[PDB]
């Protein structure tokens, strides 16, 4: 039921992240414009990082227990480490894409940081009632992140090239929905409520990752710079 | 006596940090000069960060036990996390204020890092005698920080505008004293000696925070840039 | 046998790092060119950081136990913290030396990060078989680091000054060998296999550190900039 029934979704997850990394490694070896290089650096780190964090969830070093609700619950603090580094790089990705000010960057990054850090604390709190208090705060940092993301990576992501507002209206819809999913998924699943089995939650989070991870990598890279 | 008698000073602390954040959020929404924006980004992160870290001290996730001296002691490792991120942002604040070299910045930041990191280790060591060895080292990193702060955020904080040396002679006296307080307070209180009840120590650290946090935020922001 | 027979190599290690820091502190106090300052900032942080991490290994706060193989093993997670910060600064050192692109930097840094972070996880895994899986991955991140280091801090470290390719052909051979040693040493010693006593491993790692730490500091600094 825990650290058992889902290794399949976790094993498949490692496979995907890793071939995903292998892919970006043997498809970025060239690169000319220092700029483009930066974008490739980023798109590789994410998969590689998310790669190892998923291998620790598979092997079991990144799965702990947490007393809450009345019994012992499985919490993959390994996930939290994953996003704890991916989300900011990825965020730096989008930012540098529509070239933003170091002010909205430091804002965003650190903001994202209160989001994930706070979320992690939530995920480890032992008294039920509280888990959701943190769920709420982390959310707020994410609704703020996303806010800047939307109203911004639209406007400040328009006054430029021809396709700018186009490709951009894509990336947004996709990042916005994609992201707001983690908040929900978390909530309904094991690490929060108990409306979704850990068995399903993982599969959900995995589709969730692989997409955000590579998916967003590709789409992102495809947006020239 | 522990994680009990002081919730009042901790509850009041959360209130203050948070309304403090709410304040900077709904008073920075405008901003023009990318520069000014950076300063607002910073002044908000601090309260927000210090906000959540104080809510974890309130709720109890950020309060642990440490065997030293002969009995079990309460240590809010949550404080250490707080300053572990605030102090460097805040430091980046002052630095960018009198526009310094990336050399004195990386120096300062990392220096501050040996200060807090080392301090944290101190706060968690179990053998009495040692606690103070770390107290000493962390201090040294802080006397070095402050050193650059004083002899610098005076000189290198003078050859510019008219009020420069003025406002600046303010900020200094205030940061210097304010800071050197944490070293002392720590020392006389529970997490170190036993000359001050945890009951009082908290109130002291709280006045201490709220001031450093917002106080320094305002004063800081008020210094144009 | 553990946290006992080697304090000598650890005590000598603290001495060396610290006088090493004292040295860079009272030999960098001047400095003119903001640039040179940055290089001095870096060379000091390393010793100072590595200083405190070695004092925690000496005093015993940075030495833990890990069930693997069949019995309890001593693991100085304190080492891992050490390199966890040194290696990236040091890396930033070499990078800025042959002035590289922010792309190869972010790449390198983060890469180094998967190396050390991953290594650390290895060092703490309880099931024998696995330890070496992580040993393998961390290695891969290091063979990639070093790769860029060699084929790069040669070419991209040539088309410049007269001595460039010279001094540079030095620094390389020295960093390359020096580094690849930590991977091997780790492997044959206590924290991995059992072909080397913890008694010897420490002495090895210490010579290893002091050299990388100061040695590389000097050599590095001596390369003007
Ligand atoms: C590669 C991973 C990505 C892009 C992850 C994004 C994750 C989030 C936006 C997570 C958000 C969460 C909350 C808003 C509430 C608490 C639970 C979290 C951490 C899943
Ligand atoms: C918002 C928080 C701020 C500005 C905190 C500043 C804190 C310090 C300068 C703390 C210094 C300490 C020492 C010098 C010795 C060990 C105890 C500490 C960590 C309280
Ligand atoms: C001052 C310390 C320095 C320059 C340390 C460098 C360390 C490494 C390159 C360590 C590498 C390791 C592996 C490749 C495999 C796992 C064991 C490690 C962490 C020792």
Coordinates of N, CA and C and ligand atoms in Angstrom, one line a residue, chain B residues 83 86-87 90 115 135 138-139 142 179 182-183 186 212-213, ligand 2:
Chain B
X83 N 16.3 33.7 9.9 CA 17.5 34.5 9.6 C 18.4 33.9 8.6
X86 N 16.6 35.6 5.7 CA 16.4 37.0 5.8 C 17.7 37.7 5.8
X87 N 18.5 37.4 6.8 CA 19.8 38.1 6.9 C 20.6 38.2 5.5
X90 N 18.3 40.7 3.3 CA 18.5 42.0 4.0 C 19.8 42.6 3.7
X115 N 28.2 32.7 9.5 CA 27.7 33.2 10.7 C 26.4 32.5 11.2
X135 N 29.4 29.6 19.5 CA 28.9 31.0 19.7 C 30.0 31.9 19.3
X138 N 30.7 31.9 15.2 CA 29.6 32.6 14.6 C 29.8 34.1 14.8
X139 N 30.1 34.5 16.0 CA 30.3 35.9 16.4 C 31.4 36.5 15.5
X142 N 30.2 37.5 12.4 CA 29.4 38.6 12.5 C 30.1 39.9 12.8
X179 N 21.7 44.4 15.1 CA 22.3 43.1 14.9 C 23.0 42.6 16.1
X182 N 21.3 40.3 18.7 CA 21.0 38.9 18.5 C 22.1 38.0 19.1
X183 N 23.3 38.5 18.9 CA 24.5 37.7 19.5 C 24.3 37.7 21.1
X186 N 20.9 35.9 22.4 CA 21.1 34.4 22.2 C 21.8 34.0 23.5
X212 N 13.9 44.7 13.2 CA 14.8 44.4 12.1 C 14.0 44.2 10.8
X213 N 13.0 43.3 10.8 CA 12.2 43.0 9.7 C 11.5 44.2 9.0
Ligands
LIG2 C1 15.8 39.4 10.5 C2 16.9 38.9 11.2 C3 18.2 39.4 11.4 C4 18.6 40.7 10.7 C5 19.1 38.7 12.2 C6 20.4 38.9 12.5 C7 21.0 37.9 13.3 C8 22.3 37.8 13.8 C9 23.3 38.9 13.4 C10 22.6 36.7 14.6 C11 23.8 36.4 15.2 C12 24.2 35.3 16.1 C13 25.5 35.2 16.5 C14 26.6 36.3 16.1 C15 26.1 34.2 17.4 C16 25.1 32.9 17.5 C17 23.7 33.3 17.7 C18 23.2 34.2 16.5 C19 22.8 33.2 15.3 C20 21.9 34.7 17.1

